[PDB]
Amino acid sequence: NDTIASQDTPAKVVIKANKLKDLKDYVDDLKTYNNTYSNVVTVAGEDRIETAIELSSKYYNSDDKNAITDKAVNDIVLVGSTSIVDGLVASPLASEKTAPLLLTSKDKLDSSVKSEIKRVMNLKSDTGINTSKKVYLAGGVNSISKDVENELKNMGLKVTRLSGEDRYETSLAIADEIGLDNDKAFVVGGTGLADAMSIAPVASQLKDGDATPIVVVDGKAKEISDDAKSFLGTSDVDIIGGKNSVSKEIEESIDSATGKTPDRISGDDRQATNAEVLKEDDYFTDGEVVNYFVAKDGSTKEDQLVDALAAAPIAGRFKESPAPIILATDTLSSDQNVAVSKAVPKDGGTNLVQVGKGIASSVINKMKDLLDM
């Protein structure tokens, strides 16, 4: 009429009832409250720089359950803390190179960032610096100055800068480094910052081992660049964002170059486009997405999307079930509410990661409601 208890147990709980049904219910409630007391993390520092460091310390060279890598890294992806435009497509790079995406002030490498670089790459005097210890600067000199690049070089590291005159050339520099080996690529418009952040987790999904590159194109031009055409070759392309971000002219251009019909994932605004990324079957399976990230949307200020940039690689590689990033500062859109509802199983979500500070509590409460947390 009993089991043999562990010796370290604090109590012998004997639950008695006249009616087997009242017992059934007590034991059912006990099961429920026991299982439910456990699941919602925030990852944020006082600065955006600190948020990226908190993300690097939690997901790279870390023993954490959802870490991208547990060992010291050979690659860093560095982004100008103010310049979201320059580092925009750097998330899949960080994902495939197994590298944290850090933020730095333009003029001076932050001491906190320097400490995290040494920590995550394990740099030492007794160890030879072979041609593989690398730091990728995703952006030009007005995003990450020469002073900072020389300071990383002074530490003794190879520093490669993936940049161009603008967001477009910079994006290809980054996409070229990622490599287009699955016969698949993503495309976003120049002003589609939030769209790039919406797809960043997906691009960051290693698919048959490789991340999928994201290319920024001049969305109001007649044709995409020859560099974009050459890079894209004969591959399948998915355009993220509406006609105001990437015109129909550009879609045709991609079609003509690749010889294959490109797809389009988009909504009437950024929060809607974010919702659509989640709804897309290639990126996420219905009733099989349990892991979720939340970051500000950039409505109040565009540069505040850097939290999503730094979080996206992680979201893409998270466990064995990739996570999206819900873009929301003060409020979730109706489309996001629906998307999460259809993406999550009937049983709810298993992980919720808030990235950054200024996300209103309503948003997190709403996400907890949608995920039954």
């Binding site: 009429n1 009993d2 043999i4 208890a5 012998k12 709980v13 009832a17 006249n18 017992l23 409250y33």
Partner: protein, 318 residues
């Protein structure tokens, strides 16, 4: 003993009464052997030299207490005493003539329970052995109660050595089973031919299964039987085998759901963390018992209440 197996878990404060149940088990002969273990290591074997002799069973019970009394009374955090109990519930006897008479009264408290009612033209019941002058069944004088079928009392050759054993003696019933005014002869009532002794047989008398009628045929009956003493294992484990008793340095938390104030399943979760499988297995055994009538050691009828047992991992943080 091994964590999670079928067996009793006694807390430190109740070590004396639990050990008393094992001592009674040795005295009453339910228990043929107790292998004692201090923490994970085996330290002694307790077994009567001859189960037939009282002194040998008392000696085994005293040695049991002497062996485990300091270990149990001074049990530290993380320490425990395990008893591997070779039993045979069929050999349990009543060693005290006062306790045997206490069980005879337990059985006698059923004497007035009606098993079969007197027959009618509409409903089957008790009828007479011989039909009237016209060849029809006439109703019986009295209903069939437990007083008709068997008498109780301690056995003639009882002693502290062999045991006092409450004994049932099948009665005799001339009356049969049928409908009044019917021409077909009444069916003979099969009285108890097995389970005639109750030595407190490492068990408690299951009154739901003991002295219960089993009519065979449904709407058209063809045979009637009455069971003897049918016992239930005080633990659900089989009438012969080995059960594990374990004393631990834990506090007893009695949760009675029928009470006015009890620890809500919510506050219980807030105070301790429970093994999910320990909960889910107990829950499955409850559902199976409720839906299919399937019995389990995990959930049991004890003192008119269904009970489950939980041993949490530890306290919850903050």
């Amino acid at each position: 003993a091994t964590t999670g197996t079928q067996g009793y878990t006694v807390v430190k404060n109740d070590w004396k009464k639990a050990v008393k149940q094992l001592q009674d088990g040795l005295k009453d002969n339910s228990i043929g052997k107790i292998t004692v273990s201090f923490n994970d290591g085996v330290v002694g074997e307790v077994a009567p030299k001859s189960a037939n002799k009282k002194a040998d069973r008392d000696a085994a019970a005293e040695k049991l207490y002497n062996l485990v009394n300091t270990q149990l009374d001074k049990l530290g955090d993380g320490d425990y005493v395990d008893f591997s109990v070779d039993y045979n519930l069929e050999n349990k006897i009543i060693t005290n003539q006062a306790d045997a008479e206490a069980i005879v009264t337990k059985l006698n408290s059923l004497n007035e329970k009606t098993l079969i009612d007197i027959a009618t033209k509409d409903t089957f019941g008790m009828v007479s052995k011989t039909q009237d002058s016209e060849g029809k069944n006439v109703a019986a004088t009295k209903a069939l109660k437990v007083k008709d079928v068997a008498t109780f009392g301690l056995k003639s050759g009882g002693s502290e050595d062999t045991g006092y054993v409450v004994e049932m003696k099948a009665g005799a019933v001339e009356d049969k089973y049928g409908k009044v005014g019917d021409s077909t002869a009444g069916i003979a009532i099969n009285l108890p031919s097995t389970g005639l002794e109750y030595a407190g047989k490492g068990t408690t008398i299951d009154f739901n299964k003991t002295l219960k009628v089993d009519v065979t045929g449904g709407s058209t009956p063809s045979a009637v039987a009455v069971s003897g003493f049918v016992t239930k294992d005080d633990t659900d484990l089989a009438k012969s085998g080995t059960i594990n008793v374990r004393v631990i340095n834990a506090k007893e938390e009695s949760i009675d759901i029928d009470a006015s104030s009890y620890t809500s399943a919510e506050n219980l979760a807030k105070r301790y963390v429970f093994d999910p499988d320990e909960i889910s297995e107990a829950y499955k055994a409850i559902v199976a018992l409720q839906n299919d009538g399937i019995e389990s050691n995990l959930v049991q009828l004890v003192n008119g209440k269904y009970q489950v047992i939980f041993y949490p991992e530890g306290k919850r943080l903050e």
